[PDB]
Design an enzyme around this catalytic site. Structure first.
Site, mmCIF file in Angstrom:
data_model
loop_
_atom_site.group_PDB
_atom_site.id
_atom_site.type_symbol
_atom_site.label_atom_id
_atom_site.label_comp_id
_atom_site.label_asym_id
_atom_site.label_seq_id
_atom_site.Cartn_x
_atom_site.Cartn_y
_atom_site.Cartn_z
ATOM 1 C CD1 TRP A 201 -1.396 2.505 1.951
ATOM 2 C CD2 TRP A 201 -3.161 1.627 0.873
ATOM 3 N NE1 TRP A 201 -2.350 3.492 1.826
ATOM 4 C CE2 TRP A 201 -3.440 2.981 1.171
ATOM 5 C CE3 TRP A 201 -4.134 0.873 0.200
ATOM 6 C CZ2 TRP A 201 -4.639 3.600 0.806
ATOM 7 C CZ3 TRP A 201 -5.328 1.487 -0.161
ATOM 8 C CH2 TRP A 201 -5.569 2.839 0.145
ATOM 9 C CG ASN B 255 -2.868 7.629 1.643
ATOM 10 O OD1 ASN B 255 -3.479 7.609 2.710
ATOM 11 N ND2 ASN B 255 -3.302 8.301 0.586
ATOM 12 C CG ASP B 256 -2.219 11.735 1.752
ATOM 13 O OD1 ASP B 256 -3.048 10.854 1.438
ATOM 14 O OD2 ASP B 256 -2.542 12.847 2.221
ATOM 15 C CD1 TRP C 147 -3.746 4.691 4.747
ATOM 16 C CD2 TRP C 147 -4.487 4.026 6.753
ATOM 17 N NE1 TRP C 147 -3.471 5.694 5.646
ATOM 18 C CE2 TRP C 147 -3.913 5.312 6.885
ATOM 19 C CE3 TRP C 147 -5.021 3.401 7.889
ATOM 20 C CZ2 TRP C 147 -3.856 5.986 8.115
ATOM 21 C CZ3 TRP C 147 -4.965 4.070 9.108
ATOM 22 C CH2 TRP C 147 -4.386 5.352 9.209
ATOM 23 C CB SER D 104 -0.100 13.826 4.906
ATOM 24 O OG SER D 104 -0.904 12.694 4.657
ATOM 25 C CG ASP E 9 -3.574 16.124 6.150
ATOM 26 O OD1 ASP E 9 -2.785 15.295 6.640
ATOM 27 O OD2 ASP E 9 -4.684 15.823 5.673
ATOM 28 C CG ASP F 111 -14.505 15.555 4.417
ATOM 29 O OD1 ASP F 111 -14.993 15.591 5.578
ATOM 30 O OD2 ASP F 111 -14.832 16.367 3.510
#
Ligand SMILES: OC[C@H]1O[C@@](CO)(O[C@H]2O[C@H](CO)[C@@H](O)[C@H](O)[C@H]2O)[C@@H](O)[C@@H]1O
Ligand SMILES: *[C@@H]1O[C@H](CO)[C@@H](O)[C@H](O)[C@H]1NC(C)=O
Ligand SMILES: *[C@@H]1O[C@H](CO)[C@@H](O)[C@H](O)[C@H]1NC(C)=O
Ligand SMILES: *[C@@H]1O[C@H](CO)[C@@H](O)[C@H](O)[C@H]1NC(C)=O
Length: 537
Positions: free
Chosen positions: A16, A18-19, A43, A79, A145, A235
């Site tokens: 996996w 992601n960001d 995740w 992140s 974030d 979101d």
């Protein structure tokens, strides 16, 4: 063993992803971190995996830099971003989860200050620098974030974080004395009601008339004319919206241009599978690179079987359009190095009503497509019906086989032998009104037949292109197996998607230039370049 992995994009060799985190350049060497799971393809145990580059194409690996090894993030390393200190020092602002599951903000500096790789990151003990408490009072489960930090007309460093107050999306800002003591500013740079949480916020300036990007701390210059773009990942919609405006340094607020909220009429970087997007200033080329994550359109049962999930879209170059109310994006020129020494060409070819000419000698599953369509007699174009306002919606209500005066006509990539499964990005031209010589250019990216396995994200994406159908219409197509990025009008339209064909793979791939519409359009030119692999890890 798996024909769905990309050859020239970027992704982990396993598990996996992601960001995109902390993208920057230091000592001519670019850096890319990101959310990665060292254990599975779902995740989890997210850490800041590392990699480096010299051309934003070939990446050399490195052991994870930000990972749970202290209170302030013992539960996760979310992140973050990297700021370029006014001396050439690169730090990091990332959201960690402390022992009582609550989104705190932590800072991290590098170890060997002379190491051009910055593989070992030092994390201050004073962390977290910012945290939700009884006074600031905020959903401790909705304060993450942090963006890159920008100075100001003073020493006061400013940065914003993504939060939400009872459905009220916003960006909480914290002023900093000297990048250590951070005061919680009593007013968000901006906010919008209705839209849920605000994620992966990004704030940066753009010169009005200039191609090369601007620095992050540029303020009121009498010669240059700057504008501002605040982008935030939503979101409950899973899309990315930005907005352009001004920045009254007084109230430290962001003021979007003439009637434009961050949700309702906000433009997307990409009108397809895009997310967690973030930018960064390239010191070396004087440009602004744009990174975007892009989900996995395959069922999780697949991510578990294929062992991986998550690719990174090709770094894009963005900047304000001449009109001043839309960002122009276009993949980094240095990527065209993966282009086969050869060259597939096709010029001046007619596309009779419902015709299609194949593009032969090219790795149909790993190439760079590019067409320049010419439309004669625009009058033959139909006049849009009132309701048709959402791009996506129109492309979904009118599939490929539904004819139009001017359309549908574009490309068919990773097309199967005899079209049992193909992808079709194309155009459709209509008249805005009837005599007020104004047309609407529809860019559609159909996914309904992208593959034979019913279990896939077949949702079709739609978009409008602010180009003048009087001249020829452009459309580029990066082709890389599972991932396909669409570009119209020189980036003015960016619709990306994820396909997983059972017949359209490897050496069994075909390309197609079609036009199944009424009126016949012409191919002024078309170049397909096979694409060699890029060293990704
Ligand atoms: O650490 C996770 C990292 O991913 C983001 C990307 O926007 O989290 C969003 O996506 C998750 C997967 O769907 C959701 O579970 C999460 O609630 C959502 O915010 C970042 O916000 C976050 O840093
Ligand atoms: C670690 O950083 C120091 C900085 O003083 C540098 O001298 C050294 O070369 C680095 N480690 C090595 C030997 O790679
Ligand atoms: C806001 O916080 C409350 C309590 O901390 C939590 O129950 C709720 O889910 C949060 N809202 C969201 C989903 O952001
Ligand atoms: C994110 O990817 C999933 C598959 O994991 C896909 O179904 C979805 O459409 C994408 N975005 C969302 C949450 O809509």
């Amino acid at each position: 063993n798996q024909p769905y992995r990309t050859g020239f994009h970027f992704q982990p060799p396993k598990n996996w992803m992601n960001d995109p985190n902390g993208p920057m350049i230091y000592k001519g060497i670019y850096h890319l971190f990101y959310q990665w799971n060292p254990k599975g393809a779902v995740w989890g145990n997210i850490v800041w995996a590392h990699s480096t580059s010299t051309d934003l194409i070939n990446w050399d690996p490195h052991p994870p830099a930000i990972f749970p090894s202290a209170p302030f993030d013992i539960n996760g390393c979310w992140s973050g971003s990297a700021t370029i200190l006014p001396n050439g020092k690169p730090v990091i602002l990332y959201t960690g989860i402390d022992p009582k599951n609550q989104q705190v903000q932590n800072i991290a500096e590098p170890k060997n200050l002379s190491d051009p790789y910055l593989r070992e990151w030092k994390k201050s003990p004073l962390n977290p620098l910012m945290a939700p408490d009884a006074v600031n009072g905020i959903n401790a489960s909705s304060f993450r974030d942090p963006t890159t930090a920008w100075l100001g007309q003073d020493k006061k460093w400013r940065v914003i974080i993504g939060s939400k107050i009872h459905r009220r999306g916003l960006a909480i800002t914290y002023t900093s004395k000297d990048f250590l003591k951070w005061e919680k500013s009593p007013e968000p740079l901006h906010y919008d009601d209705g839209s849920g949480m605000w994620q992966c916020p990004d704030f940066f300036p753009v010169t009005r008339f200039g191609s090369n990007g601007v620095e992050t701390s540029s303020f009121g210059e009498p010669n240059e004319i700057l504008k501002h773009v605040l982008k935030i990942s939503l979101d409950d919609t899973k899309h990315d919206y930005y907005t352009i405006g001004t920045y009254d340094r007084v109230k430290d607020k962001f003021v979007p241009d003439n009637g434009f909220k961050m949700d309702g009429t906000a433009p997307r970087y990409d009108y397809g599978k895009y997310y967690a997007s973030k930018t960064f200033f390239d010191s070396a080329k004087n440009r602004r690179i744009l990174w975007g994550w892009t989900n996995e359109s395959s069922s999780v049962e697949d991510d578990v079987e294929k062992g991986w999930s998550g690719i990174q879209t090709i770094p894009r170059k963005i900047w304000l359009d001449r009109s001043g109310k839309q960002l122009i994006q276009w993949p980094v020129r240095e990527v065209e190095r993966l282009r086969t020494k050869q060259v597939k060409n096709l010029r001046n070819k007619v596309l009779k009503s419902g015709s299609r000419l194949e593009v032969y000698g090219v790795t149909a599953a790993q190439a760079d497509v590019e067409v320049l369509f010419k439309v004669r007699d625009l009058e033959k174009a139909d006049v849009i019906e009132p309701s048709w306002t959402d791009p996506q919606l129109i492309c979904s209500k009118m599939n490929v086989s539904v004819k139009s005066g001017l359309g549908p006509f574009g490309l068919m990539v990773l097309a199967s032998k005899n079209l049992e499964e193909y992808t079709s990005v194309y155009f459709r031209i209509f008249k805005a009104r009837q005599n007020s010589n104004k047309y609407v250019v529809l860019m559609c990216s159909d996914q309904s037949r992208s593959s034979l396995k019913e279990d896939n994200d077949k949702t079709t994406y739609g978009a409008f292109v602010d180009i003048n159908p009087h001249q020829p219409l452009s459309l580029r197509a990066l082709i890389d197996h599972s991932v396909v990025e669409s570009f119209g009008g020189k980036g003015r339209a960016c619709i990306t998607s994820r396909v997983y064909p059972k017949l359209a793979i490897g050496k069994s791939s075909h390309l197609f230039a079609f036009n199944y519409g009424y009126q016949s359009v012409d191919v002024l030119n078309l170049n397909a370049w096979s694409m060699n692999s890029a060293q990704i890890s």
